[PDB]
């Protein structure tokens, strides 16, 4: 948690549906946005911070909290617009004799600034004698090791945390979703959408040849007349069903 890892995400389509369908990820406390609703949204960058904490400490991973974790290890800002996912890691994180592979910063002269990382190990001088780099009276090493054990109590059993931040920059959004997009019919008017365009028409087959990059079609009178089918690249037509006034 003191040396929390940060994976930056870019240029992909995230099937949030994938983790949103797994009970192991029980703690899905998210602030600033709804998960169902953001699967139809796009951000420039996404950041994935992960680390392992004890069982009841999951609460500190939330905006405006205090404690060893939030003050010295992983602080979220007051104005946080992402999610926190946490699940028990009694799978392999714990060992019979204990895994000396986890540390939590215990002392630090100052609370973190949000999303700040501190991996520097310099004795915490609490007295007024310099410590010179050896632990002793009023001279404390910064980190300590969690005694993860299989029989440990739930509040002290293992726990992984994944923290999703979403940012919006003037840069084009490199992150989106698949949005369950496959359907095609012919010779019947349908509220058809092809990657963003709308309309209704009897979409048939065209003898007309696009160029490989060209997407839409037009006439002398700024009317859409052909849409290349994105999945099976073919030239369609567009014609709304018959209209015209009736006359008695």
């Amino acid at each position, epitope marked *: 948690v003191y*040396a929390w*890892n*940060r*994976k930056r995400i870019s240029n992909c389509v995230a099937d949030y549906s994938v983790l949103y369908n797994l009970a192991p990820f029980f703690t899905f406390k998210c602030y600033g946005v709804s998960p169902t609703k953001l699967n139809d949204l796009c951000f420039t960058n996404v950041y994935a911070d*992960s680390f392992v904490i004890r069982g009841d400490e999951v609460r500190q991973i939330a905006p405006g909290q205090t404690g060893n974790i939030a003050d010295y290890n992983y602080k979220l800002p007051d104005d946080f617009t992402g999610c926190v996912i946490a699940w028990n890691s009694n799978k392999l994180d714990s060992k019979v004799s204990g*895994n*000396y*592979n986890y*540390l939590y910063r215990l002392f630090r002269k100052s609370n973190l600034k949000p999303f700040e990382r501190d*991996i520097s*190990t310099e004795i915490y001088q609490a007295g007024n004698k310099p410590c010179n*780099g*050896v632990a002793g009276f009023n001279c404390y*090493f910064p*980190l300590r090791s969690y005694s993860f054990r299989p029989t440990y109590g739930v509040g002290h059993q293992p726990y992984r945390v994944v923290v999703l931040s979403f940012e919006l920059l003037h840069a084009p959004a490199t992150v989106c979703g698949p949005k369950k997009s496959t359907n095609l019919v012919k010779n019947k008017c349908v509220n058809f959408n092809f990657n963003g365009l709308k309309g209704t028409g009897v979409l048939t087959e065209s003898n007309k040849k696009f160029l490989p990059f060209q997407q839409f079609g037009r006439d002398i009178a700024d009317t859409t007349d052909a849409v290349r089918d994105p999945q099976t690249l073919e030239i369609l037509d567009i014609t709304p069903c018959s209209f015209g006034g009736v006359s008695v």
Partner: antibody
Amino acid sequence: QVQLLESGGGLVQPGRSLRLSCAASGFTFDDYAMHWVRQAPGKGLEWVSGVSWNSGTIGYADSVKGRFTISRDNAKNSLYLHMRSLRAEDTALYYCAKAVEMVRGLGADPEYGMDVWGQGTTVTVSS
Amino acid sequence: DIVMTQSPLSLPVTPGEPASISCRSSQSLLHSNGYNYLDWYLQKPGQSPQLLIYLGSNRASGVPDRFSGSGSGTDFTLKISRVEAEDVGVYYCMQALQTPFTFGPGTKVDI
């Protein structure tokens, strides 16, 4: 070309600290699990510590457990090894090696294959 | 906490013949995938060591086709199809399964 440069050597008395640093240059530093391997003077090699692709340590040697502390930084492409309770029996060369299999390229994640080795430092302890 | 041994402890080889070295373990390294995790490394004297074989028998990159690796269970062997003047030094076998990792005492090959 791939370069692994380490620094931090020098005579230090017993009962102090040191901070060895290994810097990598020439590859995507976040798809390779680093390792720190000692080399006693005129003896065989001996694994010391390691770190996976996600900054998650993979345990230390049985006789060294308790003092050494590894840390990584993908932003600066830097791996560091804080050393505590230095004793006379800790004098040796120290190489920082890199794994071979890039992660998710094929069961589990890879950790074997120390292929590229920098020229180690010459840490020593005496009074 | 796995202890490995090598044999022979030290053998003299002459340029133009094959040689065979055996590494033995305590617990068979057959993983669930079916792969042995033992690795063979050559530490040339006066120079940093270099990789020879990874994943039991999959030949490493950039080394010539004169080396062969075989074995399974708790016994593995490395055979130099043809030995030459540039194959002298120390050889080690290192586990890649139950952490911490371990390195054999080392075989000393000379002329």
